[PDB]
Amino acid sequence: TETDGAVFPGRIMLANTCTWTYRGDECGYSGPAVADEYDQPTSDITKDKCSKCLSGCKFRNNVGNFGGFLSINKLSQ
Amino acid sequence: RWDTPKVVKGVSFLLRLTVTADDGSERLVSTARTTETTYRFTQLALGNY
């Protein structure tokens, strides 16, 4: 139960990148392999990986479950 | 023109003007947030408001 080196609220809120796992119970993807570690098409289950960017979501046709708020300009403007 | 009521810190006066329509509804003509107690309106038409 030791709580060394841990922070309580474990969310980053927003970024250009997603902040979850792949094929978990929040991403909610169960389709065939389409993308790999980078933005390269593939069709093998062994090298199924998501770059956790917007391009990965566009590849997987699953954007409504994206964990990054697209603000960007709130810090500038 | 009016007077200043009991106040904490500081206040401003928000005043809006509405015009009774022909059917019976209301039409809002402008609005103003000011600090002076006295305000003046110019170039008003139609009837009751």
């Binding site: - | 023109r1 009016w2 007077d3 200043t4 107690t37 006295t38």
Partner: protein
């Protein structure tokens, strides 16, 4: 004037047709214990650094 309690005022200047003016009134606590008065008269009150 100093001693323990003092009061002062300046002549109000307004008039020029019936109107209604505001009046801001505020109390300030300076320090504790028996203090002395201002180095000069009512001039020591500085509103907006004047």
């Amino acid at each position: 004037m100093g001693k323990g309690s003092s009061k002062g005022h300046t002549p109000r200047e307004a008039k020029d047709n019936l109107k209604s003016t505001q009046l801001l009134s505020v109390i300030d606590a300076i320090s504790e214990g028996p203090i002395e008065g201002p180095v000069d008269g009512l001039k020591s009150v500085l509103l907006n650094s004047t």
